């Protein structure tokens, strides 16, 4: 009886295995774009993935992770919120059923179709592992996606797909660039916050552009082929693995623009 998106062991459920699930800084949260506030104390926020290097593509059951060899100093993430600098391990998405919802974040309540999640880890940790015991272990850079144009740089990845219908199978998928998938802006909204699936830890720096990308209709249906099941196992489709918003508890969410 693993965890997942469904009636009995959905997000309203977590907090059994997970009792950190009621805690004090988790995530998604809505974000009140009247309520927060420009800082301008924020320096500018750095992205740099030119030297990126995926392994691999992995529907783990619950997504599907595009992973990178992060053995050396490369695509990094510093600035902004952040003190020092974070590494890209993986990104993965969630998705809705509809394209009416998807995302996790949600800004003045508006769901979007989809979320991106480009998950760094702080270097003064070592490692991911240790940087998950940490309250700044980690940084995510979160991206809406909206349905209209296609986005080429996404393609790659909904290609692959098909060879990783069910839940464990991996491709080998080298020279991936997450450039592809960023948004022209930089202009973000930041908080403290959680993993949004178990184990829910609370060692994210959320970063989460103002700016959505724009995928097609056919991009994110191919999503939505995926399989919650592994292979021979009668099909559950891969659909609306989204968190919904959790309590803010008086965080304060900072705005990167005027
Ligand atoms: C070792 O690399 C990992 C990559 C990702 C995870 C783990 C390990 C352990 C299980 N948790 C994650 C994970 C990362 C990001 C999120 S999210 N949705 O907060 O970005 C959720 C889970
Ligand atoms: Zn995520």
Redesign the pocket.
Known sequence: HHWGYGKHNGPEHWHKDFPIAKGERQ?PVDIDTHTAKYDPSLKPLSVSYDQATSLRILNNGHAF?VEFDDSQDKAVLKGGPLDGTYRL??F?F?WGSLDGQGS?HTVDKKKYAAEL?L?HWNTKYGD??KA?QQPDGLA?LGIFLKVGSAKPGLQKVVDVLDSIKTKGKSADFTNFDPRGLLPESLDYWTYPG????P?LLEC?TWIVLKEPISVSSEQVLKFRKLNFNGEGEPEELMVDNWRPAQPLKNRQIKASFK
């Open positions: 995530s992770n391990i993986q993965h969630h996790e999640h998950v991911f592992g998950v995510v959680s993993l949004t699936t184990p994210v």
